[PDB]
Structure formats: C-alpha cells, structure tokens
C-alpha cells in the first residue's frame, strides 16, 4: 500500500465540512419560518457547522490513521471512521447509551459500506458481467466468478487447513496395504 | 470612429443585468412587466448585433406583441397583491 497524509487530508476535510455547514446554514435561514435576517445564519442554526466539520474531521482522520496503523486499505478503516463520526454525532445528545449506540451502529453501517467496496457506484471491471465467468477450461487458476467441476486438493488444504477431516491424502489410499 | 461600436455587446449584457434587477425590484408588477419588455428589446438588439434581426423582429411581434400584452391584460383584470422588497423580509437570502 501507499501511506495517507493524515493532516493534509483532514485539513481539506475540515474546510469542506465548513463550507458545507455554511451552505446548510444559509439554506436553513432561507427555508425557515420565523423572522430572520443575515444575523441568524449562525445564531439559529442547530449546530450544522459543527456537525459537518466534526463529522468530516473525525471520519477522514480516523480513516487515514487506521489505514496507517493497520498498514492496509480495507473496510475496517471505514468501520472505525464511522465509529468516530457516530461518536461525534452522539455526543450532541448528552446521554451515554445514545452515544454508544450511535458509535456502534454507524460504525457497523459505514463498515458495511466499506466491506462492499466503499462506493455507492460499481467498480465495472470487477463486476460479474465484465469479468471472466463460467467454467474454466484447462487446468487454469480459478478466478473469483469462475466455476470448476473439480478443484485442487493442495488448494483446499491451504485454504482450509489440515485437521477436522481434511487431509493432504485420502484416508483409504493413505491406509492401503502396500500389496 | 471605428471602435465606437465595439462594446455594444457588453452594453447589452450590462443593461440586461440592470433590467433583471429592476424586474426583481419593482414595486408594482406592471413595472416588472415593462422591464421584461425592455429586456426583450435588449435581447432583440443583441440578436441584431450577432446577425439575426429576423429573430429580433419575431421576438418583437410575438413576445412583446402577444405575451406581454396578455400579462398586462391579466394584471389589469385581476387583484394581485404584492409585498414590497424589504430588508426585514429578503435580507436573509
Ligand atoms: C461555500 C464554500 C463551499 C466550499 C466547497 C465545498 C463545499 C461542499 C458542499 C457540499 C454540499 C453541502 C449541501 C448541504 C445540504 C443542503 C442543506 C440542507 O439543509 O439540506 C436539507 C434541506 C433543508 O433542511 P432544513 O430546512 O434545515 O430542515 C431539516 C429538518 N428535517 O432540504 C432539502 O431537501 C435539500 C436537500 C439537498 C440534498 C442534496 C443531495 C444529498 C444526497 C444525500 C446522500 C445520501 C447517501 C448516503 C447513503 C447511505 C445509505 C444508508
Ligand atoms: C443489514 C445486514 C448486513 C449484513 C449483510 C452483509 C453482506 C455484505 C456483503 C459482503 C460481501 C462483499 O464482498 C466484498 O468482497 C470482496 C473481497 O472478497 C471485496 O474486495 C474488493 O474490494 C474492492 C474495494 O477495494 C476492490 O475490488 C478490491 O480490489 C477487492 O477486490 C469487495 O469490495 C466486496 O464485494
Ligand atoms: C449477503 C450475501 C450477498 C451479498 C451481496 C453481494 C454478493 C457478491 C459478493 C461481492 C463480490 C466481490 O468480488 C470482487 O472481489 C473479488 C476479490 O475478492 C475480486 O476477485 C479478484 O480479486 C483479485 C485480487 O484483488 C484476484 O486477482 C482474483 O483472482 C480475482 O480476479 C473481483 O474484483 C470481484 O469479484
């Protein structure tokens, strides 16, 4: 893998969240009911700026940190980032069990989002349609979407491990009397 | 003498900005319709400038001649109350 620059990405994160919070505050000011002016965009906004900035900083910082600590790029980093973002969103409600639930559940949700590829889109060169499918032809290495009538036994033993029934030689041939 | 008529596209752009602001700003909507007519005149000018005077005349005879006429026709016949452009109402935008 290639390391992430935490502080730079998180500074970009904070500026983006700040701009988004300003836009949401302006939208709230214009959509609202009561008497309002150019003063109220930050007085009467329900912590929108702090929501956006905190979520952005927390998510990007935690993601890049976990990617640099774990030394990997996978969906567990999105699980941690969701845990942190949920902790921020749940510290607003000044209650412990709601904070814990927010953390755990948005961690699980963003971790699912990362497990599935960290994308609302598709890869479109890893999809089943664009990838080699069906039965594999002549002793070739079975790819992900390919099908096989009969698999290699060394592969089974490595993927699964010896023990609990699964052995490098069948039992009957391995116990056959040398006659 | 040559370049006295150079900036006549920029002048139309400026006047269009002005007439849109006056449309948004006018107290009585009749005045907003009149400024819309002025904006159609400015657009027809610009269309003559870029070489489409046929479309300028088509605009004058269709938009100003029928659509603006119908706008005036309805505001002469219907009660359309209006709130004036205010700082206590619109500055939030
Ligand atoms: C200024 C400097 C700029 C700097 C550059 C960088 C800036 C980045 C800006 C990013 C965009 C920020 C836009 C913020 C959203 C718009 C503001 C908003 O409040 O949206 C909701 C809006 C009004 O809501 P409101 O009147 O406040 O009342 C809420 C009570 N329920 O009411 C609305 O209906 C409008 C909704 C707009 C939504 C747009 C589409 C969002 C897509 C949703 C993503 C969902 C995907 C997640 C999927 C997960 C599945 C579990
Ligand atoms: C509400 C209950 C939720 C519980 C249900 C959980 C089901 C979620 C689906 C889990 C399986 C998703 O399958 C997952 O597997 C492979 C690894 O095997 C991931 O692995 C792939 O990730 C993507 C993102 O980098 C790239 O293509 C990468 O090269 C890799 O090939 C995929 O990103 C994802 O498709
Ligand atoms: C709740 C159950 C249902 C969940 C809904 C989703 C079901 C489909 C599961 C997701 C499929 C993900 O599959 C995707 O990842 C696998 C890796 O694991 C990739 O498979 C590819 O991985 C690469 C390594 O990156 C290797 O070269 C491998 O030989 C293969 O080519 C493909 O890019 C794609 O097939």
Technique behind this structure?
A: cryo-EM
Cα distances (Å, whole numbers) of residue A48 to A52, A162, B19: 6, 56, 37
Q: Which residues of B touch A38 (CB under 8 A)?
A: 91-92
Beta strands in chain A (DSSP E): 134-135, 146-147
Q: What was the resolution (in A) of this experimentally determined structure?
A: 2.7
Ligand 3 centre to CA of A3 (Å) is 24
**Partner residues linked to A147 by β-bridges:** A135
Distance, CA of B66 to CA of B46 (rounded, Å): 21
Distance, CA of B82 to CA of B29 (rounded, Å): 8
Ligand 2 centre to CA of A167 (Å) is 30
Q: Which residue of B has its CA nearest to A27?
A: B93
Number of Cβ atoms within 10 Å of the Cβ of B21: 11
Write the burial class of residue B29 (CB in 10 Å: 0-12 exposed, 13-18 middle, 19+ buried): middle
Nearest CA to ligand 2 atom 20: A117
Q: Which residues of B touch A28 (CB under 8 A)?
A: none
The count of CB pairs under 8 A between chains A and B is: 13
């Amino acid at each position: 893998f290639h390391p992430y620059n935490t502080l730079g990405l998180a500074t970009q994160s904070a500026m983006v969240g700040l701009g988004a919070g300003v836009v949401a505050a302006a939208a709230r000011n214009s959509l609202a009911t009561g008497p309002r002016n150019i003063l109220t965009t930050f007085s009467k906004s329900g912590g929108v700026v702090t929501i956006f900035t905190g979520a952005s900083i927390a998510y990007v910082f935690t993601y890049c940190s976990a990617a640099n600590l774990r030394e990997r790029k996978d969906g567990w980093n999105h699980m941690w980032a969701g845990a942190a973002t949920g902790a921020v969103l749940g510290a607003r409600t000044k209650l412990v069990p709601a904070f814990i639930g927010w953390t755990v559940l948005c961690g699980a949700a963003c971790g699912l989002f990362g497990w599935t590829g960290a994308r609302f889109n598709a890869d479109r060169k890893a999809s089943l349609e664009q990838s080699p499918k069906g039965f594999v032809q002549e002793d070739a290495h079975q790819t992900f979407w390919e099908v096989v009538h009969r698999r290699p036994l060394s592969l089974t033993v490595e993927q699964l491990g010896e023990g609990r029934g699964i052995n490098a030689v069948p039992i009957a041939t391995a116990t056959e009397a040398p006659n | 003498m040559m370049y006295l008529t150079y900036y006549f596209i920029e002048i139309t752009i400026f006047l269009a900005i002005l007439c849109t602001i006056f449309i948004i700003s006018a107290k009585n909507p009749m005045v907003s319709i009149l400024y819309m007519i002025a904006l159609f005149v400015i657009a027809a000018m610009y269309l003559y400038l870029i070489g489409l005077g046929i479309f300028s005349l088509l605009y004058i005879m269709i938009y100003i001649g029928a659509i603006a006429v119908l706008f005036l026709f309805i505001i002469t016949l219907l009660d359309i109350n209006s709130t004036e452009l205010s700082v206590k109402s619109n500055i939030r935008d």
